[PDB]
Design a protein around this ligand. Structure first.
Ligand SMILES: CC(=O)c1ccc(OCC(=O)O)cc1
Length: 165
């Protein structure tokens, strides 16, 4: 079960951890992927989760895209969690480095509300280019279900906890 998390609010918890390693340990009902609209799991959280599934997540995702077309920025889809979780909720946060609308971060987090408990990264953080402090603020103000945030970077984790309002 979820261990070593710091409680931020009634429903938001945070831990300095590799989300892939957290997923293998807990095998949560839902692990959130920091997806793009094409479900191309190239780098960041997506690349790491996909690599831990031995590329099964990418093969499954390519079949999903062939059938359904791309996701919307702010949107999501539920696919298999493979060896990591029961399900993977692929959530598309805005990628500021791709010139996408940061104002869509709240819509992206609203997807978490369809799941009672989730293991997740901070949306639009890392290679998506948004301010992770702002992403945690939107998470806390949008997500009402139990979210266990895994922040990979130790210095970022400390900065997020120490600056949390
Ligand atoms: C050994 C094992 O149980 C295993 C499970 C899943 C693996 O990749 C993900 C998938 O195939 O969907 C690889 C290995």
């Amino acid at each position: 079960s979820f261990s070593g998390y710091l409680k931020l609010t009634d429903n938001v918890y945070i831990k300095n951890a590799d989300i892939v390693e957290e997923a293998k340990k807990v095998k949560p009902t839902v692990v959130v992927n920091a997806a793009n609209v094409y479900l191309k799991h190239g780098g960041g959280v997506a690349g790491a989760l996909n690599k831990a599934t031995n590329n099964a997540m990418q093969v499954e995702s390519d079949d999903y895209i062939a059938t359904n077309g791309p996701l919307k920025v702010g949107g999501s889809c539920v696919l298999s969690g493979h060896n990591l979780a029961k399900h993977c909720l692929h959530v598309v946060g805005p990628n500021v480095n791709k010139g996408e609308d940061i104002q869509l971060l709240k819509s992206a987090y609203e997807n978490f509300n369809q799941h009672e408990v989730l293991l997740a990264p901070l949306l639009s953080a890392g290679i998506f280019g948004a301010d992770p402090i702002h992403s945690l603020r939107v998470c806390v103000d949008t997500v009402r279900t139990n979210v266990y945030l895994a922040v990979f970077d130790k210095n970022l984790y400390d900065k997020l906890v120490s600056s949390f309002l």
